[PDB]
Amino acid sequence: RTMVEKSELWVSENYQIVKGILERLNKMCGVGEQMRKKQQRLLKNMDAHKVMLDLLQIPYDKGDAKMMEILRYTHQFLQKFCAGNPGNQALLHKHLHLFLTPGLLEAETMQHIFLNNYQLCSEISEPVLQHFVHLLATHGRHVQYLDFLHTVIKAEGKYVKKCQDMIMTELTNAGDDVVVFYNDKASLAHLLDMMKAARDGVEDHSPLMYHISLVDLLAACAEGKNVYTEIKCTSLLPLEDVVSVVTHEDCITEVKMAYVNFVNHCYVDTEVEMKEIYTSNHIWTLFENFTLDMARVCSKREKRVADPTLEKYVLSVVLDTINAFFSSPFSENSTSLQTHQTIVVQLLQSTTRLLECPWLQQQHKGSVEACIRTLAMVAKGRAILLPMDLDAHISSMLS
Amino acid sequence: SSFLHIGDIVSLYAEGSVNGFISTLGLVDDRCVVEPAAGDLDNPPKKFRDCLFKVCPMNRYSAQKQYWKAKQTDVVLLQKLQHAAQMEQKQNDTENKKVHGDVVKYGSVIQLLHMKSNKYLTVNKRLPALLEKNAMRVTLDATGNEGSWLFIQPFWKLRSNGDNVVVGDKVILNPVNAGQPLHASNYELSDNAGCKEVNSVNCNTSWKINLFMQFRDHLEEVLKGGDVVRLFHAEQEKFLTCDEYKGKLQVFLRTTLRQSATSATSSNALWEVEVVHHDPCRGGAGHWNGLYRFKHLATGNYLAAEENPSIKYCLVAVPHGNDIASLFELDPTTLQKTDSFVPRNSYVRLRHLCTNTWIQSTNVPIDIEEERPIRLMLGTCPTKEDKEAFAIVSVPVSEIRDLDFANDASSMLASAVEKLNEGFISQNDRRFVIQLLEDLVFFVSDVPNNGQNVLDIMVTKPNRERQKLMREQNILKQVFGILKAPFRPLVRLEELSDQKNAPYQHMFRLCYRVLRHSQEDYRKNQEHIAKQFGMMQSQIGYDILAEDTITALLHNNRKLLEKHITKTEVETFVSLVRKNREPRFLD
Amino acid sequence: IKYCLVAVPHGNDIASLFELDPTTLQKTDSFVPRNSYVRLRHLCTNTWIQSTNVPIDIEEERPIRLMLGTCPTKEDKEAFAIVSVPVSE
Amino acid sequence: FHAEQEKFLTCDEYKGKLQVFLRTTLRQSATSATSSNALWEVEVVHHDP
Amino acid sequence: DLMESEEKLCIKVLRTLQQMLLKKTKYGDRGNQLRKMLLQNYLQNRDWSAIAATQCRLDKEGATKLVCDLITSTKNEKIFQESIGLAIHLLDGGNTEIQKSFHNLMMSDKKSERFFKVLHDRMKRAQQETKSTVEMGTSVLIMQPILRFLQLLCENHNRDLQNFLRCQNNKTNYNLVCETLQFLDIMCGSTTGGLGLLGLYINEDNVGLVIQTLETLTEYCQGPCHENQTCIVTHESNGIDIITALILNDISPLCKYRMDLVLQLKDNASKLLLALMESRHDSENAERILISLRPQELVDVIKKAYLQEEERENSEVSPREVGHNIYILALQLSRHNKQLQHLLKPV
Numbered sequence A: 001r002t003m004v005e006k007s008e009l010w011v012s013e014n015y016q017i018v019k020g021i022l023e024r025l026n027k028m029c030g031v032g033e034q035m036r037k038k039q040q041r042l043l044k045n046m047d048a049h050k051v052m053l054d055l056l057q058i059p060y061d062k063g064d065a066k067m068m069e070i071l072r073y074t075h076q077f078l079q080k081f082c083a084g085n086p087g088n089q090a091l092l093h094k095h096l097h098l099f100l101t102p103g104l105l106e107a108e109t110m111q112h113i114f115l116n117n118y119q120l121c122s123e124i125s126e127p128v129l130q131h132f133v134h135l136l137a138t139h140g141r142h143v144q145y146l147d148f149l150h151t152v153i154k155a156e157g158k159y160v161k162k163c164q165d166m167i168m169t170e171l172t173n174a175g176d177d178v179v180v181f182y183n184d185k186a187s188l189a190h191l192l193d194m195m196k197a198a199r200d201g202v203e204d205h206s207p208l209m210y211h212i213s214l215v216d217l218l219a220a221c222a223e224g225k226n227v228y229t230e231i232k233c234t235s236l237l238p239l240e241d242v243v244s245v246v247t248h249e250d251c252i253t254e255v256k257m258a259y260v261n262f263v264n265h266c267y268v269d270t271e272v273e274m275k276e277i278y279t280s281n282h283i284w285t286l287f288e289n290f291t292l293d294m295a296r297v298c299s300k301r302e303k304r305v306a307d308p309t310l311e312k313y314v315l316s317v318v319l320d321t322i323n324a325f326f327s328s329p330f331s332e333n334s335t336s337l338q339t340h341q342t343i344v345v346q347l348l349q350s351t352t353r354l355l356e357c358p359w360l361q362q363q364h365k366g367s368v369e370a371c372i373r374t375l376a377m378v379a380k381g382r383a384i385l386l387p388m389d390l391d392a393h394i395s396s397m398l399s
Numbered sequence B: 001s002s003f004l005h006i007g008d009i010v011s012l013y014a015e016g017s018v019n020g021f022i023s024t025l026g027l028v029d030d031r032c033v034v035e036p037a038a039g040d041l042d043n044p045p046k047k048f049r050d051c052l053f054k055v056c057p058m059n060r061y062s063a064q065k066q067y068w069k070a071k072q073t074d075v076v077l078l079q080k081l082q083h084a085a086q087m088e089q090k091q092n093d094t095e096n097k098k099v100h101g102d103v104v105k106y107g108s109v110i111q112l113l114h115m116k117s118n119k120y121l122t123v124n125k126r127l128p129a130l131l132e133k134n135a136m137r138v139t140l141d142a143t144g145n146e147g148s149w150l151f152i153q154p155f156w157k158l159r160s161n162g163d164n165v166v167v168g169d170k171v172i173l174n175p176v177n178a179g180q181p182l183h184a185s186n187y188e189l190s191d192n193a194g195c196k197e198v199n200s201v202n203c204n205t206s207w208k209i210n211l212f213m214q215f216r217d218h219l220e221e222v223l224k225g226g227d228v229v230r231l232f233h234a235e236q237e238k239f240l241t242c243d244e245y246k247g248k249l250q251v252f253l254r255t256t257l258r259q260s261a262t263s264a265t266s267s268n269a270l271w272e273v274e275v276v277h278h279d280p281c282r283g284g285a286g287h288w289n290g291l292y293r294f295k296h297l298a299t300g301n302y303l304a305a306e307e308n309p310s311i312k313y314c315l316v317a318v319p320h321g322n323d324i325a326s327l328f329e330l331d332p333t334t335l336q337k338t339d340s341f342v343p344r345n346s347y348v349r350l351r352h353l354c355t356n357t358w359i360q361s362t363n364v365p366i367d368i369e370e371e372r373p374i375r376l377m378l379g380t381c382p383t384k385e386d387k388e389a390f391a392i393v394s395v396p397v398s399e400i401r402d403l404d405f406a407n408d409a410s411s412m413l414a415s416a417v418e419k420l421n422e423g424f425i426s427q428n429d430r431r432f433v434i435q436l437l438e439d440l441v442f443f444v445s446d447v448p449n450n451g452q453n454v455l456d457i458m459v460t461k462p463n464r465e466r467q468k469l470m471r472e473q474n475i476l477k478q479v480f481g482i483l484k485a486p487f488r489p490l491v492r493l494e495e496l497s498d499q500k501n502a503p504y505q506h507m508f509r510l511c512y513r514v515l516r517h518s519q520e521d522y523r524k525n526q527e528h529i530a531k532q533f534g535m536m537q538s539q540i541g542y543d544i545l546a547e548d549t550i551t552a553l554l555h556n557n558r559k560l561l562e563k564h565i566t567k568t569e570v571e572t573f574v575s576l577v578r579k580n581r582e583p584r585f586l587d
Numbered sequence C: 001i002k003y004c005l006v007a008v009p010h011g012n013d014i015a016s017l018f019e020l021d022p023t024t025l026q027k028t029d030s031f032v033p034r035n036s037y038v039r040l041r042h043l044c045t046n047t048w049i050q051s052t053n054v055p056i057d058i059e060e061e062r063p064i065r066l067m068l069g070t071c072p073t074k075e076d077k078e079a080f081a082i083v084s085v086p087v088s089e
Numbered sequence D: 001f002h003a004e005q006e007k008f009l010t011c012d013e014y015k016g017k018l019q020v021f022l023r024t025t026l027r028q029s030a031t032s033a034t035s036s037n038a039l040w041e042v043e044v045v046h047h048d049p
Numbered sequence E: 001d002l003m004e005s006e007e008k009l010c011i012k013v014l015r016t017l018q019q020m021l022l023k024k025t026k027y028g029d030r031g032n033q034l035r036k037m038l039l040q041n042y043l044q045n046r047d048w049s050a051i052a053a054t055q056c057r058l059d060k061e062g063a064t065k066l067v068c069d070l071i072t073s074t075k076n077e078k079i080f081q082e083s084i085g086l087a088i089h090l091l092d093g094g095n096t097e098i099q100k101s102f103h104n105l106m107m108s109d110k111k112s113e114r115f116f117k118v119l120h121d122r123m124k125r126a127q128q129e130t131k132s133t134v135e136m137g138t139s140v141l142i143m144q145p146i147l148r149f150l151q152l153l154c155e156n157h158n159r160d161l162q163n164f165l166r167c168q169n170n171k172t173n174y175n176l177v178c179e180t181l182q183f184l185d186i187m188c189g190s191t192t193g194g195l196g197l198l199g200l201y202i203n204e205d206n207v208g209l210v211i212q213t214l215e216t217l218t219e220y221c222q223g224p225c226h227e228n229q230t231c232i233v234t235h236e237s238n239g240i241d242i243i244t245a246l247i248l249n250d251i252s253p254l255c256k257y258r259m260d261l262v263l264q265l266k267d268n269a270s271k272l273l274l275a276l277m278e279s280r281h282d283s284e285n286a287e288r289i290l291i292s293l294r295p296q297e298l299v300d301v302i303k304k305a306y307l308q309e310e311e312r313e314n315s316e317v318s319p320r321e322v323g324h325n326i327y328i329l330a331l332q333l334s335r336h337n338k339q340l341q342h343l344l345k346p347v
């Protein structure tokens, strides 16, 4: 604090001490979970936050390459000052204006301030969201801003309807700079080209990561049975492009999971009827691809190998999508479901075979069982032919 | 040297990274660019009408901004907001009229209004510039908003805040909201060659204010440089026209069968009057003593006199007006007030300065080969005839703006047609095409855009001028091209119902609505559209609103029905009903 | 930089003559107002004054003398203000 | 006073000859940098000496 | 002297002076016991009139000069607020001696220009903040005590102090009446509010500030001071339009849940309008008010107010009393407007 009050000298001797002090403070600030709470309370009592914030306000030159590292530690300290401490988040939320500056390091601290704090996320003022959206539009396309936008939507499990609606209203306004999508043939080819270099894994901060985060945010903001955001987001990403990008042979699990989540929360789980989903032969190709993925996962496990991303994709989003499609008020009508019956039997047999495998952990076995149950109810109403062995195996668990 | 005043017409010449005049690409396009190769201070650009701005006082947009916000996201509240916006607009108009002529001082707030497009220059901090990312976009908005406010700050230390601005002084234009001075960047537009983007970003650019017209001289009761006028021969009751006869441009008098000669108004008959001045960038009100030049608005050529091939001299069009031959002088046909300003709608006699010969109209036609020649020759003769006088009839600025908008729309529509023919169209290009189609629908309908559905618009009385503009400027041809090219692989009529093709369906419906609106109460447009009856028939049976257009075209038109229905049309109807067995075709 | 501003012993020579050009609008060529910006032009050479950034005392550690010269062209930026000094000073 | 350069015209002996130049001042306000060497006298040319 | 360094000490001294001027307060049985014990230990040996006597005593000590100097030379918001509060307390009750001391200090002091400049800058900052926001900002909050202080400064119909506030004998003259009028005009939404949307802008949060501003305007106008009435009526901001709209229009949102505040606001607006023409024989003010104030709307408002007496429940102002005040205003306006006079006649 004394040095910060007189920062003109260093803004050589007054740099090493600063970096050492910051490194020590960051190192001893957090240990385990209870020592972390004790240190947080102790630092709050002696007002370390005011000192740390004051050091951030020092007028500095655009390019130093030495003092910048100091700010690379200061912010980190503030990140550990609020971990699981809503009081600390409220304390530094009063001075939030200091963090409304272009940059990437400040974005992480801003995200951590609003992390798992419903009282703040639900009361976030419009200027913060506008600032972040305009930074995304003008400054550039970065994943930190998308992460901040995402964390504020869902806090403590509950979804913030106001933020969900406003983020949609302001994101769709800017196009080709913020909401970048690859729907055209040339754009699809470019997307495939960039993806092909990520077969071994999606590089962090790459444009593919930005696209995945954007799709995830778009799906999440409509995860409230909303009628305004759901219809608004349907035009930007049509079902045709979703199916085309999900059914491609050279497709990684991340984009497939993102698209399946989008078509589950924005298309299937909806408050109003969508013509394309039911009165079109689009979701059935997705179901065929789901069966193919199930068979591929079974074969991979049989080969004493496994891909955790593929396991998560096949056990989290596909099952939820299948359950939602076959467990909706508009699906029991089966105006077009009568024409297609073989796909239902294929899905049922694939799901029951997946259950038959012993490696299925108990936590996610309930979703598979629920999918089988829903398919059984659909089959009973639809009067679809059932194989003898499959029928007996299903009836073993029906009652 | 004179002080800058509110209402003066001036042109800005950037002299920073790139030196040149600031202009706009077109009326339909909101981008503003600088073209260094177009011209300089010594030699102003040929299309100087596109580089003229007017200084206007500060305006209030708070109530309008609230109304727009309400529209973006109760009925009584919306009506109250609309009324408040109307009162705010009236108050702004009254204040602007009141502050007319006041001197502009450094550090004050001014607005720049583009004369050709009647749109305020605006800076949007939220949206970055297209070519330059770190900079802020600059565009043109017809209504305007708080982004149009600018500070005319000094560029020379010898000038200080609070001092009167003097014509010819270099200044800095700092937007009030964005806060970053305008900059003529070096980024070059891909579509347009030689044009550099203008964007809001920190720089050292200096804007030189060149005065084109004073606030006092800006009145509609006097002839002024840059004015658009028509030359009417009272004795022959014909309008001067310039057109390509076989392969060369010729100037003639056209023959009209209309009962009223004055009613025979055409775009080719428009001319622009340029007052000869020592300063190339200065116009102003003209004088009887002062010399004049006439420029063809459509082609850009200048009227001149050349040796007669065989009536000693011939009136013709030349590419460059810098030549002394283009000079002309006016002689009053009646008494004048001490050689005062030339009054509007005043009969005059044109004489060639170089040859000292007076214009005259000859009865020898130029198109004898044609069945009904309509082009009459002109020439300069030494003698002066009082009967041979040309009246200069003024054209309203609104008509010129409408013509420019029609030309720009036709150009962009032809570009879109070429893109569709190539087989690939970008999403942004398709959105621009749809927006232009909606704008054209509103243009022909002559109904203000108040959020009403474009596909559902009814007109109490059609505007004949707008329909004639649409037919003459080839907008209908481009509309037919758009209706033909996609269907003729890229898109299929049967697949139009697909959601992926929904924008295409909207575009086709907009085109058909434009066709329906254009032909209402107009024989020539009705025949021109009916010439594509086969194409219109081929598209029947799909949700493209073609049936409504066909019904409107063939409704209560006996002569049109007789002429434009043949055996092939009935055969097509029979084939369609056979293919579908649809009773609607029997109806 | 065709010519250099310098000091000469005798002012009777025609070279010492200079003329003032207003930097702003003036009242019918009335008296020169006090504290008024002006541009100086050499009558004999018909050249306008201008300030160059080339110093005269490069040898010094911190040069402070900047050179001046007359050039044929006229620059509106290059204007010298005549600030009056009180008689008491 | 040169507004563009914010410097006062001065005349001084550099090495052995008088030279006219613009002086550089470190003061915050250029106008405040007033020196005796910067004083000039204006003589109006008249027919009567 | 100590404000330059010991700012906290100056604030404490000002608060102690304010407490001394304030009336006695009860602090409970334990508090009373402690107070009595301490008074006996230390002070072993020993009504508006008492407050006025204490105010005169402090003025003799130089409290008015102290507050004026602090306000003029203070760069800290807390010190300025404390000085304004102390000045309000000194002027509490409209004491003539305190007003005369204030006037003499302003006239004799050489920094009166600086004092009014500080007040005017605070007022402009408050209006700018109100425009920007349209909770309460610090400027809009500090404006309330300033308005209260000015009202007490001009209380009891003091011609000299009202004239001094309107104009000063200094090189730079700051008009506080027009600043208050502009503040009220901006709070109400300006032309948008005056066009029938005033209800949206007015809320229970700013209703108190609006009422205080209206009361201050009435205090300025009454006496009657023709100059203040002319300035307010003919001001370019057209705040009289807002004043007329207040009476003519009903604030739908605030009135829906809270009607007593509406009644007080309408009563204050009617009193202000009556004060605008207390003794004005000339008719230009009447015509200006009639331009905004339509005859038929005025008589309809009066008739509604008379039949609105049922709203008096849980109200400190009778709707019929406000109707009677508006009726008196309409009677005064009638002579100029024939239609208003004809309408006001009974069946």
Ligand SMILES: O=P(O)(O)O[C@@H]1[C@H](O)[C@H](O)[C@@H](OP(=O)(O)O)[C@H](OP(=O)(O)O)[C@H]1O
Residues within 6 Å of the ligand: B255, B256, B257, B258, B264, B265, B468, B523, B524
């Ligand atoms: O009276 P109608 O049947 O409407 O026909 C009009 C007129 O009689 C001429 O045919 C033509 O003028 P010109 O021969 O002089 O071109 C005009 O075209 P326009 O609309 O292009 O003026 C027509 O509209």
Ligand SMILES: O=P(O)(O)O[C@@H]1[C@H](O)[C@H](O)[C@@H](OP(=O)(O)O)[C@H](OP(=O)(O)O)[C@H]1O
Residues within 6 Å of the ligand: D024, D025, D026, D027, D033, D034
């Ligand atoms: O701020 P300080 O410490 O008083 O120093 C003054 C100023 O900063 C310069 O050193 C000098 O001006 P120049 O370099 O332009 O001579 C001036 O001399 P002066 O008093 O002779 O103007 C000093 O008085």
